[PDB]
């Protein structure tokens, strides 16, 4: 008989930004990071993983054209309208989300993935006025 | 010291003195000694070398104060008008006492 359990770790954050990347192609890696999928002391039920921080938001490439080609229905008020929003908008009118959303649909659906999304901390920087230990990853 | 022996199609890593279930063995009596194969020395100041099935002769010395144990269970298959609660599996356990490496 065996067992393989980890005690109370210590959230080892990460500061990051590759605005030269394609969100998604990036987001994944971020998500992968979020939940401790890289750190070999796994426990899908625990909630241990990097406290990922992304700076210098946007500036993100995005392959082919999403000049209103990428729509964000996401919003369905309730009476008769399902308000749609193209990329351009979010970029101009407060971006960040752009990447945020990309991360949500990569993190699991439970109160955990919900909790994990609480880790991610993206800003439209550069500048992450919120850290005491940014371990910028490459 | 470390070590990884295989028994009952299953392989465990043992130390210098301990054990649990392992599965019925013709080691008929309780106070008896048996030696199961080994798979990775243990890295300690004594070694740390594995290899192809590590059949390097060396093995683990195991005694064992056992007696075919069992355990609750209850296996109730059930379809539909088909019920078969007709199952109690306790599974025979075989307690061992790992000695030396």
């Amino acid at each position: 008989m065996k067992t393989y359990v980890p005690k109370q770790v210590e959230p080892r954050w990460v500061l990051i930004d590759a605005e030269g990347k394609t969100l998604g192609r990036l987001a994944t890696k971020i998500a992968t990071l979020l939940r401790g999928k890289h750190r070999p002391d796994w426990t899908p039920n625990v909630a241990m993983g990097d406290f990922v921080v992304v700076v210098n938001a946007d500036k993100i490439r995005v392959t082919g054209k999403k000049l209103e080609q990428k729509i964000y229905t996401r919003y369905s008020g309730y009476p008769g309208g399902l308000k749609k929003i193209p990329l351009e908008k979010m970029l101009a009118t407060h971006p960040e989300r752009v990447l945020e959303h990309a991360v949500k649909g990569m993190l699991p659906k439970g109160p955990l993935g919900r909790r994990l999304f609480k880790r991610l901390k993206v800003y439209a920087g550069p500048d992450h006025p919120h850290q005491a230990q940014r371990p910028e990853k490459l | 010291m470390f070590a990884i022996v295989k028994t009952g199609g299953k392989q465990y890593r043992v130390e210098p003195g301990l054990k649990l279930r392992v599965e019925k063995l013709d080691a008929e009596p309780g106070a008896t000694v048996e030696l199961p194969v080994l798979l990775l020395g243990g890295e300690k100041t004594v070694v740390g070398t594995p290899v192809v099935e590590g059949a390097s002769v060396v093995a683990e010395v195991l005694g064992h104060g056992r007696g075919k144990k069992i355990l609750v269970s209850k296996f109730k298959a059930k379809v539909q008008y088909r019920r078969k609660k007709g199952h109690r599996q306790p599974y025979t356990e075989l307690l061992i006492k790992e000695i030396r490496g």
């Binding site: 065996k2 393989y4 999928k37 890289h38 750190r39 070999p40 002391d41 796994w42 899908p44 | 470390f2 990884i4 295989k6 299953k10 392989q11 465990y12 890593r13 798979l39 990775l40 890295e43 740390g48 070398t49 594995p50 290899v51 192809v52 099935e53 590590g54 209850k74 296996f75 109730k76 298959a77 059930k78 019920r83 609660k85």
Partner: protein, 117 residues
């Protein structure tokens, strides 16, 4: 001779009830709401003991992989590096080395890529 139901039943039920103690509502207060439950509970356990097995199969791979990925290699490559090398060992499970005594693992990795020189 008239054989009354007498006791029989009551007992026949107390049994099933005990079995279903701690359940939700009538689910654990009804000689039958209980039954119906204990049924699901039936396969559930059974079907799961089958899952649990292959549950850890996966539960480990992650470790292995998310462990030997630190030494620049795929769990995919890794494994193969062993099969074609020789190692009816490690037992996706016993790759618990990747955690406890990671140096034991190290040699393995290097051992791995070896077979693929």
């Amino acid at each position: 001779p008239r054989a009354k139901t007498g006791v029989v039943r009551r007992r026949k039920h107390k049994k099933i009830l005990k079995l279903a103690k701690g359940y939700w509502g009538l689910r654990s207060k009804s000689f039958r709401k209980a039954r119906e439950t204990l049924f699901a509970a039936g396969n559930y356990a059974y079907a799961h003991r089958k899952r649990r097995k292959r549950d850890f199969r996966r539960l480990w791979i992650v470790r292995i992989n998310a462990a030997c990925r630190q030494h620049g290699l795929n769990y995919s490559t890794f494994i193969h590096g062993l099969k074609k090398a020789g190692i009816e060992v490690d037992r996706k499970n016993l790759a618990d080395l990747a955690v406890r005594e990671p140096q034991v693992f190290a040699e393995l990795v290097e051992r791995a890529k070896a077979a693929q020189g």
